[PDB]
Design a binder for this molecule. Structure first.
Ligand code: NAD
Lengths: 493, 493, 493, 493
């Protein structure tokens, strides 16, 4: 069971460059807030273009040929990553409590799901460190040809606020495993866990300048990271508008490599032959997980007509059993929304759903005076023209849509520009294989949902992002291929 | 549709060495018979130890460093294989007719299933020719390490009689693609198609000595191939007893590499939720294909109790629709057995099945005065202790067994020393995945049977054989890994 | 030897959509000229936004689920590619002559290097067609996870004029092999060979709409291809400025995948221990190949000080043996420049080199009143600040630079924003590996130059492009990964 | 620096079955001796056929479907291997001292070379644990086909005495990583370190029965392991005669998979252009490492004629600087031989070399009254017909042979039935590549020797073994491929 949380004292609130702690060049500090109580946790140094510039200088120096990080053995890189994972596991309680407090997330989920995933991903990347290999090629003519997979260079990574630690680890695992150096920009809502992890990275024994962390504001620091000319690759997780902005900024400077992890409107199809209890439980989990603040949240629940009513009824009942309170309080299953802006956005989208004429089963309003709490909400009879069926709500709002024919529901689920995930619930094998082949989603789950692991590559199809993460194919993205061809006297098979 | 067969004239009946035709040293020639009418086709030169030694000398000389075959480009090897496949496709009619006459197999099956499979396998291997690659390894220390996949050397291959052309192609495809040279020994029952293919190989433009064919008797020629010290690898397809002898002989001399493909008592499980018509059709196809002369033939049809009777009834009716006659005759679907020894063995096994007390539904006796025809036969109420449930009949005899609980049938199907194949018929995803995981078979088929393609690796568990064929893993077997490590001044990631 | 060229009649001058020939919507036709004689070959239909839109509609319809191209077997795609390659080999003479006339390239080089490379690349892609595979993943929990590599969708490809057929094949090989559909835009200078290949594609038996070709002007047709919302991927080969524009336009529209091939200022290092004759011959070949109109042309010839003088002298002698004349004339080694704009650009760059104070050893002016011919040119004592040492000349101009220290020359060669290729000439084993590791180029040659093959991946590092082509890693670029995870009752190792 | 050794107390001297310590069924115990002083260390239980049978029963029960080891996650297997490696690193001193005492090996080499290699190999295998993957195959027809790589089953491993811990780890790393269960038979000379590691394995938390260790005599316990029918695979490291016997015995029983790691007569070619000091140092190291008791020991030192004499002189001087004494004593560079039988065999081979007429430079006789020490020995003018040039001496005896032509020395080095290793010393890239391609050895070193790491596969070519170890290809050997093909309604690319 999770261990009781203790007093939280925050000491790391600065810019982490060259294994040192620097104040911002301008000298400005922005506050950070607690969603559960609307209180300032602390102040954090505000990074801008100068800080990003000096961080990139430090990383570029650390990436030079002959530097301690470039001549280091790959097995040693894996060893360093394992030591970092062990250090994280040592401080599991403090990191979980900081994640819960800062990001307004349930302590049990911030302990048994977040840090476990972080540790597993770190250890997986550490295992992959010394096992990615080039090739030897049977080229025509008297030649000996091979290909090496080298680190790309300097990678600038932009983290979202919904999973600070998990996304941070997913960004700095494959990057450090392949040998790159990173300058990371955490979200302005949740910058603390990344700074503590930076202190742990310094303790672990990474060479100075390998990992640098600049906390600031996205429009200034993130733009500087994306428009920098000395940065070789940029990885970004967030909204599609900022994703387009990042892509265009990269197109305007240095033609750097770009990896995007944008959002999506994930459908969850339930067929007449599916197990009803499992389907209900996993649909509720898919839409209501982490207060609905997930990129892969099942927002459009397609349910076959013959079992529609019953499903809806049970769904309603489940939404009533959800309890809403302070994250650190035991027994709660839903915490507050991240900040006031998303809170007001969710309220506006719920009101728009009511205005467009969608049946309201449970919820549909705010909860509590202090904090940002929204009641679990269910919208039935959602048509394809409603805004709640098109725009990513990113909140605890569930839509239940009806269908009769399989081809029609396939065309409906593929009728979007979001291709991040999909879910199919059925007992048949032919239906499962056919639907999983037909759907245009980066990940298709069958009889389950929200199942992510470090091994399986993850990404979006159409506009949910470019590239994949968490896998051998994910590790492919952080390396550059160099081909060497040597003229030899004579070749033999 | 298949094109009408023509007159057959057989010219190639000698030993094929160094792209030449040699009489055997002993001067002895053994006849070859036609199963349909019991007539001598022609006399074929009888290979022996001296002929095998001569062929091995030729192949070893053709494998020397700097020889035309060793300096040849891999793409050129693929080009030669494609030319061989086009030449085979040019002579599809003559090869199909020769296969039908020699092996006693239906002309339609010899044309639409054998030649097509040979062509597809040859083209697949030709594609693989120049795409197998070594690796570059991140070894510790200031070293640069890579690995090359080289041809093993001389490979002696022993072919069965049930699929002469198909097995010959499966042997000389991966071997020639990886650059090896082959000395093959065809079955004494069906030597002619391999000799015609040898003539085609000479026409295609392979360097002399790359492919050598020695037709003879297994105890003399096959043993000489297996006991030879110059031969580097031996591949053998045939019975388990001869395979045991081959493995022991290889252990005695030269410690050569051994690949064994042996038979098996393949189960075929049909569950209550399976589609009855498809299950009946594919079980009938699986047991009765090629007069049951297949290594993967479904010999133990486990059928769930609640649907037992009905299934049996339908099965019986299907076995009555089988027509037995001359292979070249249109409209026939079953030909004669390969030779009289197997014919009498099948009759003895049927009589023993009758004696042990298994219900006889259809067949159980010979057909026709001239030929080696056995009526299609069905045995019901087959228990685990019966000999027909333990010994590979290799004839058109079908056993139907009853079960109730899934775990019991799993233990029954795994209670054997054969692991070649299996088959599951069901409409449920969970049952399909569970059974396919829990079965100890090299290939598991769900809702189908007898589906073999050049892309998927093929092999057996337990005593069914060692190694795999027809795939990247199959191409792994015909290569040897050489690791080269070079001391360098300094290494960088 | 190359067969004698014959008369040329050009019938294919329209837009190729849905295996049909359409006039442009506007109705305008632009002429195409012959560099050797400055004569109009014929008028070609001028494609614009409407033509691109209807071609993309046709391709999208051809890519629909259940269409003939999507249900077709991968082996059948390989078969179609092989048939296309055979059809090309049948019309080798006409295609070589058309390439020589349109692109102003030597007939011997067109017949022996362009057509052979196209055929080899097509056959290599056809082999790769049915051998790219997903994976099965040992995910945690009672789950079964696999990954499929599907075609991306519609791919718009933009071809340069220096290697029309070769680049066209390098584009439509990996795209059709993975199952995608293509809308290609040929260069306005050389559109004819692509149209003839389109007619051959129709003859081969590809389904309608799989391949579409729109000839036009880049600022109108290429921009419409790069900004189209429906198009899934864009591949572009050309100048860095247009590539920057393509990247920005893709960032503005639906965030399509982008592959870029851009030029570079490739260095060629010659050390004191290198074989002088081979180094001289291959440096001359590297810089002067195809009138210097190559992306990988060795523009900066670094030569060690102690062997500088002699090398230069020998180089001068070689440049005097180069003969300049009409491409179809036998015995010529250099043809005309592609068009007047590049011709004047080359003359201006030569004059600027003269002005900045580089020693002129041979050439430096035009040859011939009729045509676009520039004498082979040699510039010695080139310093790092001269424009001829920074700006890609794309003409028969050679720069010879001097160095003394290995580290300094490494820094000089890496002191650029181009990373396309590099060349090292030495007899040592430590120097070769050290320099090949230390150079920031996408392809490093040792003791050779200009060695390209379908097997080895090809691409640029910093601003020479993104991604790779011609290889397994190249085939990785044209596929999208879909992860399917199924909840199972129980998993076993 | 190595830490000072302490008092050694040995408590583990029994048979390790089902995470328990059992006395032998017979009740007999054989002593174990210390080579340095010829003293009994302790008595170890003597395993025979009954003990092997019950160990195989325990392992087979542990391998059953649904058992804790089979349902365990692959990441958990890697975690267990990492915990075992950490436990070994905790007891580095005791294990190093036990290895030094039992095997008569230098304490500094036992600490800085054996324990480090064991830890690195264990961590490498633990990383590989959850990263080996099946495939999904584009099979023809409306089918979905994939392949899983399952554990083979029960593996019986036979360890030599030269590197007890290192070979034990090389055996139980890939076996446990792929999920198999092991019954291991250690050498009768050095059984103690394996027993201590077994106790550590029990402490780490492996399920009972996963690892079982039976110490005994090779002719009885090893034969029982190799002839057992319930055993699925056998891996054996040792002499070629016993390997031949193992292969034949396996061919007589249940056709189990066989992996052999036999000996070799490794050449070491030194060319005129090689660095003399590095060549001398690494040749001396290669021949004299671990008292010459290595499978890859460079026994035939081919040196080019023009630099022969000088090399020999320097070699002689190096052999005089070797110091012979007790292993635990600091400063010593050579310990005693393993036991008296090998000691007398080495003396007999030295005497035979003297008799056949080979010039004796240094050594050639015994050293010390108590112990099994042999003086470092150098034999010059060794011809191809001498027994010292053919038979693996396995002792500190060095042969120096002369050559003049590269082709002749290539033929000489390939004129043998051993193919384990080779070494080339040169400063030329063309010579290095040519010789490394031409040599028939499983591992070719350039300008170095005796460089082994967990990443690079290791094995012999002709009669030095069958298979590879320590790498992805090495991990291929411990898995079986199962192909699953499912009939689907319709397939799409
Ligand atoms: N492969 C090459 O030909 C190549 C490689 C590197 C450098 N270059 C440079 O290219 C110069 C010649 O310029 P060029 O444009 O005639 O050849 P190019 O190779 O740059 O051709 C660019 C391609 O993109 C198209 N295009 C043009 N403008 C476009 C636009 N605004 N948007 C989208 N597509 C557009 C063109 O039709 C052509 O197919 C040479 O002087 C050389 O320096 C060419």
């Amino acid at each position: 069971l999770p261990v009781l949380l203790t007093d939280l004292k925050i000491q790391y609130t600065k810019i982490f460059i060259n294994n040192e702690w620097h104040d911002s060049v301008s000298g400005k500090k922005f506050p950070v807030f607690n969603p559960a109580t609307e209180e300032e946790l602390c102040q954090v140094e505000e990074g801008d273009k100068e800080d990003v510039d000096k961080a990139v200088k430090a990383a570029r120096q650390a990436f030079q040929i002959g530097s301690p990080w470039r001549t280091m053995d790959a097995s040693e890189r894996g060893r360093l990553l394992y030591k970092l994972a062990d250090l994280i596991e040592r401080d599991r309680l403090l990191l979980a409590t900081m994640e819960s407090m800062n990001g307004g997330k349930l302590y049990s989920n911030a302990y048994l799901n977040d840090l476990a995933g972080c540790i597993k991903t770190l250890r997986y990347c550490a295992g992959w460190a010394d096992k990615i290999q080039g090739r030897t090629i049977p080229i025509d003519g008297n030649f000996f040809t091979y290909t090496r997979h080298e680190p790309i260079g300097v990678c600038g990574q932009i983290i979202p606020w919904n999973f600070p630690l998990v996304m941070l680890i997913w960004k700095i695992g494959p990057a450090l495993s392949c040998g790159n150096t990173v300058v990371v920009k955490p979200a302005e809502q949740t910058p603390l866990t990344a700074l503590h992890v930076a202190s742990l990275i310094k303790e672990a024994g990474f060479p100075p300048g390998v990992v640098n962390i600049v906390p600031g504001y996205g429009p200034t620091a993130g733009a500087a990271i994306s428009s920098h000319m000395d940065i070789d690759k940029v990885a970004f997780t967030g909204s599609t508008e900022v994703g387009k902005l990042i892509k265009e900024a990269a197109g305007k400077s240095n033609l750097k490599r770009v990896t995007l992890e944008l959002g999506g409107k994930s459908p969850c199809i339930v067929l007449a032959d599916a197990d009803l209890d499992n389907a209900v439980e996993f649909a509720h989990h898919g839409v209501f997980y982490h207060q609905g603040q997930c990129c892969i949240a099942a927002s459009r629940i397609f349910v076959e007509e013959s079992i529609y009513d019953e499903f809806v009824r049970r769904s309603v009942e489940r939404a009533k059993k959800y309890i809403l309170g302070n994250p650190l309080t035991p027994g709660v299953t839903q915490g507050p929304q991240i900040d006031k802006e998303q809170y007001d956005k969710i309220l506006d989208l719920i009101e728009s759903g009511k205005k467009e004429g969608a049946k309201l089963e449970c919820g549909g309003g705010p909860w509590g005076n202090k904090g940002y709490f929204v009641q679990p909400t269910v919208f039935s009879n959602v048509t394809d023209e409603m805004r709640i069926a098109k725009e990513e709500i990113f909140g605890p709002v569930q839509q239940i849509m009806k269908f009769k024919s399989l081809d029609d529901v396939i065309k409906r689920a593929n009728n979007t520009f979001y291709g991040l995930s999909a879910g199919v619930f059925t007992k048949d094998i032919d239906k499962a294989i056919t639907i999983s082949s037909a759907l245009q989603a980066g990940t298709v789950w069958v009889n389950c949902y929200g199942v992510v692991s470090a091994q399986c590559p993850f990404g979006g199809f159409k506009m949910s992002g470019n590239g994949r993460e968490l896998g051998e194919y994910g590790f492919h993205e952080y390396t550059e291929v160099k081909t060497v061809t040597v003229k030899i006297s004579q070749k033999n098979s």
